């Protein structure tokens, strides 16, 4: 017996199954119909639902996804799309845009503002821009990512209500629904086509929200906690409210005084950081089943802090629960001085933030001033301190960083000397969960404190592999910077401090994807450093067009209220504060008129304080069958675990560039990678999420020497690198 969608029973007509598969095979090479029809080991049994037939065939086709046969990527991707299209409308052919939006609003899935903002006529018109055939350009790995999260669906029953294309056009409509009716359509079609053809990438929260009653769209947050019972109580109640929205938290507690510090004079002594830190952890995991999953955050603190030794080991598996806060990630802030004490084989002094005045502030604002105060307090005997050999301390950090791989580094001096902000008015003293973002902050004395400031991320990324030449970045830069800045006025702000910053500086975090595929296409690699110049030219275009796009919006809608606090308003450009040592590895001259931009911005300002930051993109890149950000692919075919099964995705165009790519573990070292990352920092407003890779197989006795772990860390700083992400250690 055969089960149909409507339930009407009927006999098995295998040819039907064959034809379906046949159709999806058209134009593909190295793909076998038999394999799937046998791989599936489909087990017929009297009365079987035809839908289970799809699940079975799709899965089978998936398991065949290999390097030797990459077309199984689209073959299966199309078989799925079919089931998805058929499981939502009752047939492949999608319903009219108008009818769709209508039916949805009735079910309370789409925001009713769509019917009010647009007319029936306009809808029918946008319906023409839609090209439902683009759903066949998706890779299997991308399809799965969409079906699980991207598409509007019933999490309980399992019903899916929309298709890929409808998602694109709608996200655009709501983002540009306020533009004048003169160009409102114009931007709608220009944006849709961009995202649908994978020219522009958007953050998961956006792709799965705009156009739905929901108003939570900010993936990550950066909170700064002061040295107060009140401050902490706030910083805690905050993370809670945010994590409930599944948004990552970057905590900065470095203000909290150290253990033993006198409280209220002499009526009590400080209890310690550990006690509070844990509280922050419970907050981050306040909304997870069993606390096991969800809730991710990275806490930061100075390297010269008094409790540095105790904080350095917090992520260690092996130790007393009383002195451990494993779940949270951390980021040790280091500066020029610390690195110098190591080279000269000298010691390091640990201080409590509340015992050395003007030390914290100078630590981010003025490196010189920091040195003055630092040295002074060292001789002061009355000041509580502790000496530690620079060689020992750093080793501890590198040790925990290796053991866990969640201990990140952040050079403060590089985040204030070569940044879009004025370290005196608004200095960067923290990062996000990604560790990519670099924005100023202000501690709150309460939840509704108006004078507080919270940094929020509204990211995006370009597809290096979707453009032909750098000039195509002009249009893209506009479609991106425009739609993004618009979201800032579309989403809500539960916390005042978060809103203040968003409206005050209107920052944006734009990155890139398919970078690996990019370098490969031009026949370049990471290690050798043959991509040094190309990288300089390519970014130089990505940043320029973005700075010219934000300036254009500033002339049409006014620059950000706090543009005055930015160095961009004082005539300072990224090409003026970049690490000087960067000229010893690149000679590629500027290809854009940065002088004509120095004026247009000097007179009309920028709608956004910061546009360009480099962040990791797992979900984004997948939907575009692209390579994660700038990071090189580990292997041709990557595997992951889903709720439906095993996922496989092959590097884009492996059929012609298999010998062009350079797998992660094919790299002799990290030299090249660092140089490229350093070159990027010269343009990126914010920071980059660079990982440190190591292969024990390339070391004597299979043990990574500490002489090499530091040797590389020093190189990173020497080239202006801002932050260091994960530290992968391959397992043969």
Q: Is 274 in the site for its own copies (CB under 8 A)?
A: yes
Q: Is 228 annotated as a binding residue?
A: yes
Pick from ligand DTP, its own copies, none: which does 16 bind, CB < 5 to 8 A by kind? Answer: ligand DTP
**Whose Cβ is closer to ligand DTP: residue 147's or residue 422's?**
147
Window 399 to 458, contacts with its own copies (CB under 8 A):
447
Which residue in the set 288, 399, 445, 728 belongs to the binding site for its own copies (CB under 8 A)? 288
The answer to whether the annotation marks 229 as part of a ligand binding site is yes
Check the annotation: does 432 bind a ligand: yes
Does residue 434 carry a catalytic annotation?
yes
3-state secondary structure of 93: coil
Number of residues that bind its own copies (CB under 8 A): 38
- Strands 268-269 vs 262-263: parallel, antiparallel or unpaired: antiparallel
Cα separation of 583 and 574, whole Å? 14
Q: What is the DSSP string of 462-518?
A: EEGGG-SSGGGHHHHHHHHHHHHHHHTTTS--SSHHHHHHHHHH----EEEE-HHHH
The answer on whether 524 is annotated among ligand-binding residues is no
Residue closer to ligand DTP, measured from CB, 60 or 606: 60
Q: Which of 224, 307, 436, 552 is catalytic?
A: 436
User: Nearest-CA neighbor of 473 among 482, 463, 458?
Assistant: 463
For position 233 contacting its own copies by CB under 8 A, the verdict is yes
Please identify which residue in 100, 211, 285, 341 interacts with its own copies, judged by CB under 8 A: 285
* Contact in structure between 588 and 619 (CB atoms under 8 Å): no
Which of 291, 405, 669, 696 lies at the binding interface for its own copies (CB under 8 A)?
291
Strands 329-334 and 407-411: parallel
**340 assigned to a ligand binding site:** no
- Residues forming the site for ligand DTP (CB under 6 A): 2, 4-5, 10, 12-13, 16-17, 20, 50, 53-54, 57, 86, 227-230, 232, 244, 256-257, 263-264, 268, 270-271, 287
Q: Quick one: 44 or 699, whose CB is closer to ligand DTP?
A: 44
Q: Which residue has the tokens 């370009």?
A: 462
Are the C-beta atoms of 404 and 315 separated by less than 8 Å? Answer: yes
Residues whose CB is less than 8 angstroms from the CB of residue 458 and which lie 6 or more positions away in sequence, other chains included: 203, 206, 217, 218, 484, 487, 488, 491, 508, 509
* Distant-in-sequence, close-in-space partners of 586: CB < 8 Å, separation ≥ 6: 532, 533, 535, 536, 679
Nearest distance in Å: CB 260, its own copies: 10
**Looking at 174, 220, 273, 434, which residue is catalytic?**
434
By CB under 8 A, residue 144 contacts its own copies: no
Q: Is 599 annotated as a binding residue?
A: no
Which of 349, 346, 505, 412 is closest to 721 using CA atoms?
412
Residues 6+ apart with CB under 8 A from 353: 227, 254, 255, 256, 257, 258, 302, 305, 359, 360
Query: Residue 532 CB: number of other CB atoms within 10 A?
Result: 19
Q: Report the residue number, 221 or 531, with the smaller CB distance to its own copies.
A: 221
Nearer to ligand DTP by Cβ, of 94 and 529: the residue is 94
CB of 253 to its own copies, least distance (A): 13
Instruction: Return d(Cα 337, Cα 347) in angstroms, integer.
Output: 11
Cα–Cα distance measured from residue 147 to residue 56, given in angstroms and rounded to the nearest whole number: 16
Question: What angle do helix axes 706-718 and 671-681 make, rounded to 10 degrees?
Answer: 30
Greatest extent of the chain over all pairs of C-alpha atoms, in Å = 92
Piece of the chain touching its own copies by CB under 8 A; list 134-142, 231-239, 350-358, 399-407 = 231-239
Q: Cα Rg for the chain, rounded, in angstroms?
A: 27
Is 595 annotated to bind a ligand? Reply is no
Least distance from ligand DTP to the Cβ atom of residue 12, Å: 4
Which residue lies nearer to its own copies by CB, 116 or 230?
230
Dihedral angle over CA of 470, 476, 478, 484, nearest 10: -130
From the CB of 213, what's the least distance to its own copies, in Å? Answer: 8
Gap between the Cα atoms of 42 and 38, Å rounded: 7
Min CB(259)–its own copies separation in Å: 8
3-state secondary structure 407-435: EEEEECCHHHHCCCECCCCCCCCCCCCCC
Give 450 or 556: the residue with its C-beta nearer to its own copies: 450
- Identity of the residue, 12 or 343, whose beta carbon is nearer to ligand DTP in the bound complex: 12
- The one of ligand DTP, its own copies, none whose footprint includes residue 281, by CB under 5 to 8 A per kind, is its own copies
Exactly one of 40, 153, 201, 236 binds its own copies (CB under 8 A); which one?
236
Least distance (Å) from ligand DTP to the CB of residue 98?
25
The distance of closest approach from Cβ of residue 100 to ligand DTP in the complex, given in angstroms and rounded to an integer, is 20
**436 is known to lie in a ligand binding site:** yes
Q: Which pair of tokens denotes residue 142?
A: 């991308």
Residue 532 annotated in ligand binding: no
Does the protein bind its own copies through residue 319 (CB under 8 A)? no
- What CA–CA distance (Å, rounded) separates 619 from 121? 35
Q: Which helix (H) or strand (E) holds 275?
A: helix 273-284
Let me know: does 483 contact 176? Beta carbons within 8 Å.
Answer: yes
In the complex, what is the shortest distance from the CB of residue 287 to its own copies, in angstroms, rounded to a whole number? 4
Task: Dig out the tokens for 356 from the structure.
Answer: 């050395």
Residue 119 annotated in ligand binding: no
Any binding-site annotation on 56?
Answer: no
432 classed as catalytic: yes
Q: How far is the CB of 123 from its own copies (least distance, A)?
A: 26
Interface with its own copies (CB under 8 A), residue from 7, 180, 290, 700 = 290
Q: Which residues of the chain form contacts with its own copies (CB under 8 A)?
A: 154-156, 213-214, 229-230, 232-234, 236-237, 240-241, 244, 266-267, 271-272, 274-276, 278-279, 281-283, 285-292, 322-323, 447
Q: Which residues are annotated as a binding site?
A: 4, 10-16, 50, 86, 204, 227-229, 257, 264, 432, 436, 618-620
Catalytic residues: 432, 434, 436
Q: Which residues are annotated as a binding site for ATP?
A: 4, 10-16, 50, 86
């Amino acid at each position: 017996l055969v089960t149909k969608r409507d339930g009407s029973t009927e006999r098995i007509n295998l040819d039907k199954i064959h034809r379906v598969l046949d159709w999806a095979a058209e134009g593909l090479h190295n793909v076998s119909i038999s394999q799937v029809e046998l791989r599936s080991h489909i087990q017929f049994y009297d009365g079987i639902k035809t839908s289970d037939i799809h699940e079975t065939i799709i899965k089978a086709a998936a398991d065949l996804i290999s390097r030797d046969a990459p077309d199984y990527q689209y073959l299966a991707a199309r078989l799925a799309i079919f089931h998805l299209r058929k499981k939502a409308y009752g047939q492949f052919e999608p319903p009219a845009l108008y009818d769709h939006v209508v039916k949805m609003v009735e079910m309370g899935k789409y925001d009713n503002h769509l019917l009010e903002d647009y007319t029936e006529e306009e809808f029918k018109q946008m319906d023409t821009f839609i090209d439902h055939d683009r759903d066949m350009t998706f890779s299997y790995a991308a399809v799965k990512q969409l079906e699980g999260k991207y598409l509007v669906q019933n999490r309980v029953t399992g019903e899916i209500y929309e298709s890929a294309q409808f998602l694109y056009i709608l996200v655009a409509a709501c983002l540009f629904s306020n533009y004048p009716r003169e160009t409102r359509l114009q931007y709608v079609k220009r944006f849709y086509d961009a995202v649908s053809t994978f020219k522009i990438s958007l953050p998961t929260p956006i792709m799965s929200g705009v156009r739905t009653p929901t108003r939570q769209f900010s993936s990550c947050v950066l909170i700064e906690c002061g040295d107060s019972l009140d401050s902490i109580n706030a910083t805690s109640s905050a993370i809670v409210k945010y994590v409930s929205q599944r948004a990552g938290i970057g905590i900065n507690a470095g203000r909290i005084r150290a253990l033993g510090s006198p409280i209220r004079g002499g009526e009590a002594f400080h209890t310690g950081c550990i006690p509070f830190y844990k509280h922050f952890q419970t907050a981050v995991k306040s909304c997870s089943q069993g606390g096991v999953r969800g809730g991710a955050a990275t806490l930061f603190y100075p390297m010269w802090h008094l409790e540095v030794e105790s904080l350095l080991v917090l992520k260690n598996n092996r130790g007393v629960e009383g002195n451990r806060v494993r779940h949270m990630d951390y980021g040790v802030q280091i500066n020029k001085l610390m690195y110098t004490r190591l080279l000269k084989g000298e010691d390091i002094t640990l201080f409590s933030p509340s015992d050395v005045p003007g030390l914290y502030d100078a630590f981010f604002a003025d490196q010189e001033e920091f040195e003055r105060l630092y040295t002074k307090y060292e001789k002061d005997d009355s000041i509580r301190k502790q000496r530690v050999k620079a060689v020992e301390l750093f080793s501890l950090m590198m040790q925990e960083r290796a053991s866990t791989g969640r201990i990140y580094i952040q050079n403060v001096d590089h985040c204030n000397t070569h940044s879009p902000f004025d370290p005196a008015i608004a200095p960067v003293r923290q990062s996000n969960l990604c560790l990519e973002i670099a924005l100023p902050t202000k501690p709150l004395n309460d939840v509704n404190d108006e004078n507080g400031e919270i940094a929020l991320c509204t990211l995006s990324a370009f597809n290096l592999g979707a453009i032909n030449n750098l000039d195509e970045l002009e249009e893209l830069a506009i479609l991106a910077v425009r739609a993004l800045d618009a979201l800032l006025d579309y989403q809500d702000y539960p916390i005042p401090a978060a809103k203040r910053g968003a409206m005050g500086r209107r920052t944006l975090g734009i990155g890139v994807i398919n970078f690996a595929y990019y370098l490969a296409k031009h026949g370049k690699r990471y290690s050798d450093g043959s991509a040094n110049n190309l990288t300089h030219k390519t970014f130089e275009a990505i940043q320029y067009y973005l700075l010219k796009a934000s300036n254009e919006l500033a002339k049409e809608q006014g620059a950000c209220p706090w543009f005055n606090e930015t160095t961009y308003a004082k005539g300072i450009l990224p090409i003026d504060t970049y690490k000087k040592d960067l000229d010893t590895i690149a000679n590629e001259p500027l290809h854009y008129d940065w002088e004509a931009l120095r004026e247009s911005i000097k007179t009309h300002g920028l709608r956004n304080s910061t546009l360009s930051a480099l962040m990791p993109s797992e979900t984004s890149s997948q939907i575009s069958n692209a390579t994660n950000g700038i990071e090189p692919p580990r292997g041709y075919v990557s595997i992951k675990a889903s709720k439906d099964g095993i996922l496989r995705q092959v590097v884009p165009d492996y059929e012609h560039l298999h010998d062009a790519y350079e797998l992660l573990w094919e790299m002799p070292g990290n030299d090249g990678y660092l140089q490229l990352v350093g070159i990027m920092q010269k343009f990126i407003d914010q920071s980059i999420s660079a990982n440190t890779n190591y292969d024990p197989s390339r070391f004597p006795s299979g043990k990574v020497p500490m002489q090499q772990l530091l040797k590389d860390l020093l190189t990173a700083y020497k080239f202006g690198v801002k932050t260091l992400y994960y530290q992968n250690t391959r397992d043969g």
